[PDB]
C-alpha cells in the first residue's frame, strides 16, 4: 500500500470498513478486485445498503462487505474529442439483481402488457443506456474510475501476508528479540551449525 496510493490523480478514499492504517498489517485471503468506470456522481451508489439505479440493477452490494472501495477521477484517459459512448449500463429490469452477481443478459423489457419479440416498439426499450463522456462536461458528468476490493477469510490458508517491509534486526549484544513473530529472551549470536535448505 505505497505504490497504488500517494499518486497524482485525486483519491476518493472515503470508505467504511477496514482501517487504512491496518492495511499494511492485514493478511486477507482471496481478495476480489474488480474495476469499472462510471459517470460523475455515481460514486455514492457503490455503497453497502445504498439504493439507486446502479445499486439495484447494475451492481448491488450486500449487507456485509468486509472492506471498502477505492475511486479516482480520470478525465484524460476516458475522454475523446468526439463523443465517447462506448460504455453502457443497464437501466430496465424486472427483478432486483442479486448481490455479488453478474447477469449478462440483454433482452427486451416487457414494460407494457403487449410482449415484444426482439423488436423495440412503444412499450419496449433496450435496458442498456450509454454514458456520456466528454472533457467539456462538469463534475456531475466526468468519467470516474472505481475499483472494488473485498477482504474475506476462506478455506485457503494464510499465504498473502508477505514481507510487509519489515526493517529491523541487530547484532547480538545480549539483546532480547522476537523470532518470526514470537518474542524471544535469548541472544542472536553467530552459529557454526549447518542447516538444511528446508
Amino acid at each position, epitope marked *: 500500500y505505497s505504490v497504488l496510493y500517494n499518486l497524482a490523480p485525486f483519491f476518493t478514499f472515503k470508505c467504511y470498513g477496514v482501517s487504512p492504517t491496518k492495511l499494511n498489517d492485514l493478511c486477507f485471503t482471496n481478495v476480489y478486485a474488480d474495476s469499472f468506470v462510471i459517470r460523475g456522481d455515481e460514486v455514492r451508489q457503490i455503497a453497502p445498503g445504498q439504493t439507486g439505479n446502479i445499486a439495484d440493477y447494475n451492481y448491488k452490494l450486500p449487507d456485509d462487505f468486509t472492506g471498502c472501495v477505492i475511486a479516482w477521477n480520470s478525465n484524460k484517459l476516458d475522454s475523446k474529442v468526439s463523443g*465517447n459512448y462506448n460504455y*453502457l449500463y443497464r437501466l430496465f429490469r424486472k427483478s432486483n439483481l442479486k448481490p455479488f452477481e453478474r447477469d449478462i443478459s*440483454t*433482452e427486451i423489457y416487457q414494460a407494457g402488457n403487449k410482449p415484444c*419479440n*426482439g*423488436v*423495440a416498439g412503444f412499450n419496449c426499450y433496450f435496458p*442498456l443506456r*450509454s454514458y456520456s463522456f466528454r472533457p467539456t462536461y462538469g463534475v456531475g458528468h466526468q468519467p470516474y474510475r472505481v475499483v472494488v476490493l473485498s477482504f474475506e477469510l476462506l478455506h485457503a490458508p494464510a499465504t498473502v501476508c508477505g514481507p510487509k517491509k519489515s526493517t529491523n534486526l541487530v547484532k547480538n549484544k545480549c539483546v532480547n528479540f522476537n523470532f518470526n513473530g514470537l518474542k524471544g529472551t535469548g541472544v542472536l549470536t553467530e552459529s557454526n551449525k549447518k542447516f538444511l535448505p528446508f
Partner: antibody
Amino acid sequence: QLVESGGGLVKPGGSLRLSCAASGFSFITYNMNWVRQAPGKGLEWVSSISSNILSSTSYIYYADSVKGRFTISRDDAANSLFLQMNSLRVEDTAQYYCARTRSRSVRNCTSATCPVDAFDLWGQGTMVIVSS
Amino acid sequence: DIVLTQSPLSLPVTPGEPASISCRSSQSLLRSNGYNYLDWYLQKPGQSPHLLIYLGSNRASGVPDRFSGSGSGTDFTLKISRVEAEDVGVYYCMQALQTPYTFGQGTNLEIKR
C-alpha cells in the same frame, strides 16, 4: 454515419479497403450491414454482421457470391468497419451503404435466418470504379 | 430466389389525390412471431435511402402521419393523404424473412402540375 472512407481506381486483380467513420454513438450495440445500389432500378445487399455485445462469437450471414468473393471484419474498439476484397470479377459501381439495424436485441436467429427491423443510418460519400 | 415485381410505377399522381403502391409476396411473411415483418423505405435521390414505415402497422423515426401501411400476407399497400414536393424518391418494400434478400423496382414520384 457521416463520411465513409475508401475509394478510387482499383484493378480487378487488386485489393479494396473500405472503412466507415462516424461520430459518437452506441456503436458496439448494433448489427450493421452493407447495402449496395445500382444506377437503375434495383439495389443490392452485400453482407451483414452482428455485434459482440449480444453474442460471444457473433453471427454470420453470407450469400453465395459474397461468401465466395467478399469478406467482412470488425474491430469492437473504434468507430470503423472493415470490408476487404481479395478478388474482384465484375464490380462496376459500388456505394456500400454503412447502415445499422433498428434492433438492439436479437432473438431466434440461426446461422442462416435472422429478421431485421429497419436500417436508419445509411451512409454515402464513397465511390469505386474499375477500369477507369 | 425471392425476386418480385412491384407496382408498374407509371402512375400519374396529382395533388389532392391519394397514391397507392402495392407489392406482392411469393411466400407467406410469417416467421417466429406473428408480427408483419415488412418495411418500406423512402429513397429520395441525392443523399440517402431513408425509411418511412418499419415492421408492423406502427410509426417510427418521426415520419409524417400521411404515410401509413395496411394489409398482411399476400396483400399490402400504402396510403398517402396528400403528396408534397419533398416526397419525391424511388420506392421499395423490404421483407424481413432472411438476410439474403433481393430488391424490387422503384421510380421517382410524379406530380401533375
